[PDB]
Design a protein around this ligand. Structure first.
Ligand SMILES: C/C(=N\NC(N)=[NH2+])c1cc(N)cc(/C(C)=N/NC(N)=[NH2+])c1
Ligand SMILES: *[C@@H]1O[C@H](CO)[C@@H](O)[C@H](O)[C@H]1NC(C)=O
Ligand SMILES: [Ca+2]
Ligand SMILES: [Ca+2]
Ligand SMILES: [Ca+2]
Ligand SMILES: [Cl-]
Ligand code: NA
Ligand code: NA
Ligand code: NA
Ligand code: NA
Length: 472
């Protein structure tokens, strides 16, 4: 194997780096994995299918125009070049290699399509028809859209889009499950907290945050417990950015934000799926948990969980490591079927006031077919009233002592509407035994005399009862 000769490949520091601050993609390429046979689709504003660095890998079967209801996802050209984003994301995954044009994709022999679905009124039906496009042909979907990143919205998929997620992971990809790769948000400046985004907060999406070139948390990042891992993206003006295909058959060195991180992850997942085409949607999340790397990512909240893995709310389990992903995939044993243990916690409503703590010792469905000794995702599904939602901070502590932030204070969230069975999700107790005492903390972070009531707390545990590794 010879590394790409493309003119901008040297500028793709997050791939071609020689200084341990990269995604370790060359190591996967050298193992023989480049994305051959894998199909990725970018759900965004369209794809310039005739781009000189995309045409060779373009797949009409991975593509559709939901906004105009036709097969052709070509972007709408405007003098502001508004509809360039999907083309930029597509090139991150699968720009052609060794062709004298721009740089390369992470999975530069994968097939790449795009769904034109953001350039219009984005309804529940539009989202559902995009997520559910050709699910026995497309393996991996990449998306970075969702509710406004204003730091005051709580919203997620409505009914059709949620049904698309459950159909995708259940029957998609021959029953192995569609892999939905998602950006965790861009609301950092607004102090947004990304479990309030039901798309990234879903267990069915493999959620990705960003790190800057120097290993820091970028200005736009949102912290939350639902994030799984990290890829490099943009930062300050001394830090390099993402280099990829641009609208009008050009090449950009200034692709930015968490929306540039999700496509890089989708490309790494494509290499991993080439290494083992039988991986399920849950297998893929397990591989990410086991192989991602905290080293040299700076955050003040790195904490060791119950099985010895370091986790951060900014970074999840750390930076994706493509070489490690493809190596571990090859002989991976399929995880056992997913169990779900439902524990209704409260016997009476609880006044929140200044601070509320709810402690409950659980057996995690001991003696039942849904007995879980090996956690994957956990949710605290909360229904509560409060007079100013953004003054609340919410934490959940597992029996092993792992403190997951379910909600950080959001200064712009003045809503009086509370949470209506909102399923705050954490990945930070993955592989822990969930038997024992769980603790829910709700606190008023302001000096104001705020008031409200917690009326429902359902602890929902997902996972299995076999196959644990020795703790890290
Ligand atoms: C709000 C949002 N993401 N929010 C989130 N991820 N929580 C987002 C992200 C990106 N990349 C595009 C659009 C567009 C062009 N939306 N265009 C439309 N709705 N017509 C919205
Ligand atoms: C895929 O995994 C399932 C479950 O372990 C197994 O039954 C099946 O034989 C595997 N298929 C291939 C082609 O490896
Ligand atoms: Ca069209
Ligand atoms: Ca190229
Ligand atoms: Ca957000
Ligand atoms: Cl479920
Ligand atoms: Na909506
Ligand atoms: Na919605
Ligand atoms: Na997710
Ligand atoms: Na710990």
């Amino acid at each position: 194997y010879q590394e790409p000769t493309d003119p901008k490949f040297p500028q793709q520091w997050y791939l071609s780096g020689v200084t341990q601050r990269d995604l370790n993609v060359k190591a996967a390429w050298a193992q023989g994995y480049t994305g051959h046979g894998i199909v990725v689709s970018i759900l965004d504003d369209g794809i310039e299918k005739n781009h000189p660095d995309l045409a060779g890998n373009y797949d009409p079967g991975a593509s559709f125009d939901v906004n105009d209801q036709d097969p052709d996802p070509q972007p709408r050209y405007t003098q502001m070049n508004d509809n360039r984003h999907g083309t930029r994301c597509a090139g991150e995954v699968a720009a052609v290699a060794n062709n004298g044009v721009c740089g390369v994709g992470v999975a530069y022999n994968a097939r790449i399509g795009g769904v034109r679905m953001l350039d219009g009124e984005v309804t529940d039906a539009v989202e559902a028809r995009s997520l559910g496009l050709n699910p026995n042909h497309i393996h991996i979907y990449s998306a970075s859209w969702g509710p406004e990143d204003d730091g005051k919205t709580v919203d997620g998929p409505a009914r059709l889009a949620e049904e698309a997620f459950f159909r995708g992971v259940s029957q998609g990809r021959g029953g192995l499950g569609s892999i939905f790769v998602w950006a965790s948000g861009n609301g950092g400046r607004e102090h947004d907290s990304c479990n309030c985004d039901g798309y990234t907060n879903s267990i069915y999406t493999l959620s990705i945050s960003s790190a800057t070139q120097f290993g820091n948390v970028p200005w736009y990042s949102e912290a939350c417990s639902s994030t799984l891992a990290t890829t490099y993206s943009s930062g300050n003006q001394n830090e390099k950015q993402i280099v990829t295909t641009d609208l009008r058959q050009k090449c950009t060195e200034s692709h930015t934000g968490t929306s540039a991180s999700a496509p890089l992850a989708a490309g790494i997942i494509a290499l991993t799926l080439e290494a083992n085409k039988n991986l399920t949607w849950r297998d893929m999340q397990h591989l990410v948990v086991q192989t991602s790397k905290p080293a040299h990512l700076n955050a003040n909240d790195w904490a060791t969980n119950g099985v010895g893995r370091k986790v951060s709310h900014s970074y999840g389990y750390g930076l994706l490591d493509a070489g490690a992903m493809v190596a571990l995939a090859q002989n991976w044993t399929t995880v056992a079927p997913q169990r779900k243990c439902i524990i209704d916690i409260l016997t009476e409503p609880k006044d929140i006031g200044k601070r509320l703590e709810v402690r409950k010792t659980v057996t995690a469905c001991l003696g039942e077919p849904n007995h879980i000794t090996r956690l994957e995702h956990a949710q605290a599904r909360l229904t509560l009233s409060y007079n100013r939602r953004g003054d609340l901070a919410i934490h959940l502590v597992s029996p092993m002592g792992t403190r997951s932030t379910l909600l950080a204070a959001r200064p712009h969230d003045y809503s009086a509407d509370g949470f209506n069975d909102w399923a705050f999700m954490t990945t930070h107790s993955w592989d822990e035994d969930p038997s024992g005492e769980w603790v829910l903390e709700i606190e008023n972070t302001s000096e104001a005399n705020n008031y409200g009531t917690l009326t429902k707390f359902t602890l929902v545990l997902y996972g299995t009862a076999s196959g644990s590794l020795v703790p890290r």
